[PDB]
C-alpha cells in the first residue's frame, strides 16, 4: 500500500490469497510388434547360427 | 554282425551360407571349399557336401 492524505479512502485490504488449479493433458503413443518377433525373442533355440 | 553309423549325421551351414541365404535366397554347401578350390585353380573336389 501507499499512505495518503488525512482522510482519503486508503483501503484496509492486505495480503489477499488466491488458488490456482491444475490443467490436465495426458499424452499417448502406441508401438507394436509381430508374433514372429516375440517368438524369436523369447524361445532362444539351440539351432545353428 | 555288421557295423552301422551310431548317430545321425550333423550337418551345419557356415556363415557365408547364412549371408548368401539372407541376400540371394540360395546356398552352396561346403562353400569355403568351393571358394578355395576355385581360386587356387584346382578343378575337382575330394568329396561331395
From Swiss-Prot, chain A:
Cellular compartments annotated: Virion; Host nucleus
Domain of life from the UniProt record: Viruses
Subunit structure, interactors included: Homomultimer. Makes the hexons and eleven out of twelve pentons. Interacts with triplex proteins 1/TRX1 and 2/TRX2; adjacent capsomers are linked together in groups of three by triplexes, heterotrimeric complexes composed of one molecule of TRX1 and two molecules of TRX2. Interacts with scaffold protein; this interaction allows efficient MCP transport to the host nucleus. Interacts with capsid vertex component 2/CVC2. Interacts with the small capsomere-interacting protein/SCP.
Family: Belongs to the herpesviridae major capsid protein family.
Protein function: Self-assembles to form an icosahedral capsid with a T=16 symmetry, about 200 nm in diameter, and consisting of 150 hexons and 12 pentons (total of 162 capsomers). Hexons form the edges and faces of the capsid and are each composed of six MCP molecules. In contrast, one penton is found at each of the 12 vertices. Eleven of the pentons are MCP pentamers, while the last vertex is occupied by the portal complex.
Stated name of the protein: Major capsid protein
Amino acid at each position: 500500500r501507499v499512505a495518503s492524505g488525512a482522510g482519503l479512502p486508503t483501503s484496509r485490504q492486505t495480503t489477499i490469497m488466491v488458488t490456482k488449479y491444475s490443467e490436465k493433458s495426458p499424452i499417448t503413443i502406441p508401438f507394436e510388434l509381430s508374433a514372429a518377433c516375440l517368438t524369436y525373442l523369447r524361445e532362444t533355440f539351440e539351432g545353428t547360427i | 554282425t555288421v557295423s552301422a553309423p551310431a548317430t545321425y549325421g550333423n550337418f551345419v551351414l557356415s556363415p557365408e551360407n547364412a549371408v548368401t541365404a539372407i541376400s540371394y535366397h540360395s546356398i552352396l554347401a561346403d562353400f569355403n571349399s568351393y571358394k578355395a578350390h576355385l581360386t587356387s585353380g584346382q578343378p575337382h573336389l575330394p568329396n561331395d557336401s
